[PDB]
Amino acid sequence: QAADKQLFTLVEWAKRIPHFSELPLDDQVILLRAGWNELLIASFSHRSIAVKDGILLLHVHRNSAHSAGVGAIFDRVLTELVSKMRDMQMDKTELGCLRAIVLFNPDSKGLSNPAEVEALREKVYASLEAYCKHKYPEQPGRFAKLLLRLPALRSIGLKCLEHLFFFKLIGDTPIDTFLMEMLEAPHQMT
Amino acid sequence: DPVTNICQAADKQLFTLVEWAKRIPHFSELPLDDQVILLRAGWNELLIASFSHRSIAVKDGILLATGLHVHRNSAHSAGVGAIFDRVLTELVSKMRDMQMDKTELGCLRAIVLFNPDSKGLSNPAEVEALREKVYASLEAYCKHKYPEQPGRFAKLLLRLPALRSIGLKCLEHLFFFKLIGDTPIDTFLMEML
Amino acid sequence: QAADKQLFTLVEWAKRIPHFSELPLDDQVILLRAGWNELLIASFSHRSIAVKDGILLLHVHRNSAHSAGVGAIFDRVLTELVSKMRDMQMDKTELGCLRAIVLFNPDSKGLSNPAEVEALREKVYASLEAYCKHKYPEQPGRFAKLLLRLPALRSIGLKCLEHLFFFKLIGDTPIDTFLMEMLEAPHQMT
Amino acid sequence: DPVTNICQAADKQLFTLVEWAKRIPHFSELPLDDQVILLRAGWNELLIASFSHRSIAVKDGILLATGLHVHRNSAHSAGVGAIFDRVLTELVSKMRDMQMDKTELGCLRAIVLFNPDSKGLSNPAEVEALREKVYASLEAYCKHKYPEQPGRFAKLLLRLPALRSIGLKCLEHLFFFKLIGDTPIDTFLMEML
């Protein structure tokens, strides 16, 4: 599908993060390949605050998700991220910082140079704490509260990589494989 | 422009599989709803039996039906280098040592395709029979092209548990997507240049 | 639990298999550790033929299993093994041979000496085919039919190692951890 | 007489955990049904945070609360040597490099124990607060015993995603059983002598 359009944006955005383009080329590729998931799930969890139900990717509603056999995980996205995001009114800047934090993930297997990934991460949350403390001084604990959604996004990210999750569509895989099979293409040979 | 390109390969394999199915005797005589059942239930194992036997000509890799010849790689999560390892130890290394021929492989695949356990089947017993005819023929064939090897038939059948195990990890880890997807994604990624 | 009584029988039985005790000591330990599962599931699948519903381990009935949240896998044991076992009237000798075949599993990781595991396996099915052909001559395909339940037992064996399978008992883990917590043991210190 | 012996160790740890919980302030003031929820939801991660920080004194292994010091082993399936590897790379190697103290570990554990996401909770917000008090104190503590390290607090919090990932594989692979069970089972097995 045109889910590489979604893959274009993502890459275009990492490239604009400070210092990401200065990492060894293969490290960048690992980082993106390891984060793309958490990165999307966060992007469309926050975008969803805007509406008042469901996930705004073209706009998913609870009954579909639950009917499509993926209720449990949809409820988790909404309870554990969207709502938490809405209550505390995370702003676009904070989401942007968290996502950067996620990209600069040092425990990613295969990294040629993790110390700097840590180093870059430190740089990003230091600054996020600066932001939080200027912009919302009456909430001393906000910056931790931000970071503490990362385990939630982590376990949710892992749950959207299950094969049953992707086979979300039973009566179209038969329609694919059904059509392929009524093709009378070989009913001639001479 | 990478993703849509991967969907294409997904379409091509699995068009190829379905062609293979149809050229199997009696497979097309079953109700259309059963054909879909057998295929959805079997797709992974029938692909692994292939890329495995194909990857015989290779040393220490997997040959993807399309020239690209793949390997265990550094950033591969525990699970995908693990499947890689099993594929070589339990399927490719064993197929090689016993010099399993393409007739012999065709049979095993056909026996997998006719899976009477497959949930939903309208007539499970008539798949048992098609399964049974296939192995009967496989047996006769072995005792004829390799009569000095009295236990080869069973030895062929006993790659099937492994294949089950392995078929399962691949449907768990999405090994198949990773396979056709890896180069395309790594390569587009060098759009940071 | 006294599921080591079950673990005593199992080991006592491998020891009596021909040639198993002649394998390097650590190989035997691998074989048992890799097969114990398929070995039990087969033993109590065949024992179940005897009754006319459910699993006779102290005798499990379908409603319990389905209520206990483990219906799907219980239905599989019954459809894919017990019933198939009953229809074809597998006998104790054939079960015994299949199980031996399962024990002598050559693709078990860590084996110091797999060639002989293959070798021993060959010896067992050769003989099982002898049996089958003497004892049931009018069924030429029986011996394959036997072996072809091994993928079923394999995938079923794998399904009984899932953690959710073992946590089959919700309202007793709370009773355990609940009791542990009303212990007023430390309400004294001087 | 091995199995019943493993059940014993299961009982001992998880009695030990529950003792730890109760000595946490306010934890016992919550309704009894919530205490059970927090504990069932958290047990794996709270154990991994422990055996990890304990395994600091070790090089390349895991120290099980009871002297027995364990390693990656040949017959270990992909998954269990994999968890082993992660535990050392993402938790033990990192805890070591930053010299995380037992006060600092206690806090992280307490923050895990107070998990407001935990399905079933009767009052989720009053766990948010107990979570919040804990980290507030953790913060103050870091800025005091290590003031030259302005980013340590967060750096502590960011071991938590890893711990989540790893907690999960251990509940998947039954890593915990394997740990206390392995010697006992291998050892009884030498009853073939």
Swiss-Prot record, chains B, D:
Residues 86-106 are annotated as: Required for nuclear export. Keywords: Acetylation, Cytoplasm, DNA-binding, Host-virus interaction, Isopeptide bond, Metal-binding, Mitochondrion, Nucleus, Phosphoprotein, Receptor, Transcription, Transcription regulation, Ubl conjugation, Zinc, Zinc-finger. GO terms for molecular function: DNA binding domain binding; DNA-binding transcription factor activity; DNA-binding transcription factor activity, RNA polymerase II-specific; double-stranded DNA binding; enzyme binding; identical protein binding; LBD domain binding; nuclear receptor activity. Residues 1-193 form the NR LBD domain. It is found in: Nucleus; Cytoplasm; Mitochondrion. Its main location: nucleus. Acetylated by EP300; acetylation enhances DNA binding and transcriptional activity. Expressed in lung fibroblasts (at protein level). Expressed in monocytes. Highly expressed in liver, also found in kidney and brain. Belongs to the nuclear hormone receptor family. NR2 subfamily. This is Retinoic acid receptor RXR-alpha. The chain holds residues 263 to 455 of 462 of the full protein.
